[PDB]
Amino acid sequence: MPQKWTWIPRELPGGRASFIHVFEPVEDGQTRGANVFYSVMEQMKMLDTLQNT
Amino acid sequence: MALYVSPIVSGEVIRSRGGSTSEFTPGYVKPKHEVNPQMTLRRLPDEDP
């Protein structure tokens, strides 16, 4: 089915918090956080492939 | 009706439907009438003498 987006303010203009974004920014300007797996993904994928083989 | 095309080759794209409009705009009527108080001297069928 066709996919539709929608814009949502982070908070209400009256001060109410409409939306909540929670993450740990490693460096300034990091709009999106990165999962901790990023540093070990390949070294665990190859491990499980080795186990299967 | 959908066709029985074999699951190998292709399918002709059916036209997307739609489109028809019309206009019946103006309309009008005007039954003009007046009183002409000249004939008021003569008695009506009503209003007994």
Partner: protein, 243 residues
């Protein structure tokens, strides 16, 4: 006075397109079913498609053609009774029958036999309640009441051809059948690369929507299926074409 975004216009266009796709798919299966329990023999063929045949195993006596000496019309509408012939056609079915599904043209002739019209009012001899003076007009299938053990229903279903619509059932036919009669709506495995990648071949319907590459990119909307509706026992039903 109140326009809309062309994006929303495309959205509703695609919605309508999917709707008509679903209708086109559904009418194919309905045609399958009417052919199947109308004659048993059922073949599918078309341009760019090899013909395929399907024999349910229906016997000759389950596809009785009335043509003969006194088929249905030359019988006097006044004194004759069709119930005897109904029993005769019912016995050679090997199974309980409780529907006499009917055409919208042959039911008038069936009612024309005043034997049943008088059988309606007995006060002690018939519980078969029929509904003449049709209770549903300008619509889909309509029930007509009860005929004792069997229910009377009249079908007005139409399927559209390339450019023209026409009735599913022929001009004057009828079919005795059972509610408990088992029928399968089998759907074959989808022979598509994406479907086999997803492991979703065993599906009734396969909707799809993509966009081609290249600068003049265009989207394509799809629905596909492998419908093979069948029934375990063709001989349960009896098809009679009236005359």
């Amino acid at each position: 006075q109140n326009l809309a975004d062309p994006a929303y216009r495309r959205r509703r266009i695609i919605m309508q397109n999917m709707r008509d796709e679903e209708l086109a798919i559904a009418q194919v299966e309905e045609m399958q079913a009417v052919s199947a329990v109308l004659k048993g023999k059922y073949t599918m063929t078309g341009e760019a498609f090899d013909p395929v045949e399907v024999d349910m195993g229906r016997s000759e006596e389950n596809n009785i053609t009335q043509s003969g000496g006194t088929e249905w019309s030359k019988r006097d509408k006044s004194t004759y009774d069709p119930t005897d012939d109904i029993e005769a056609y019912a016995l050679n079915a090997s199974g309980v029958v409780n529907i006499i599904v009917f055409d919208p043209k042959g039911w008038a002739l069936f009612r024309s036999f005043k034997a049943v019209k008088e059988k309606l009012d007995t006060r002690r001899g018939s519980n078969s309640e029929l509904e003449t003076a049709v209770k549903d007009l300008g619509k889909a299938v309509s029930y007509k009441g009860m005929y004792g053990d069997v229910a009377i229903v009249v079908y007005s279903g139409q399927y559209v051809e390339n450019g023209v619509k026409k009735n599913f059932l022929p001009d004057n036919t009828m079919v005795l059948g059972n509610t408990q009669a088992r029928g399968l709506r089998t759907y074959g495995c989808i022979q598509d690369a994406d479907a086999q990648r997803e492991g979703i071949n065993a599906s009734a319907r396969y909707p799809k929507n993509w966009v081609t590459t290249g600068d003049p990119a265009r989207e394509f909307t799809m629905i596909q299926s492998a419908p093979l509706m069948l029934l375990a026992d063709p001989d349960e039903f009896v098809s009679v074409q009236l005359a």
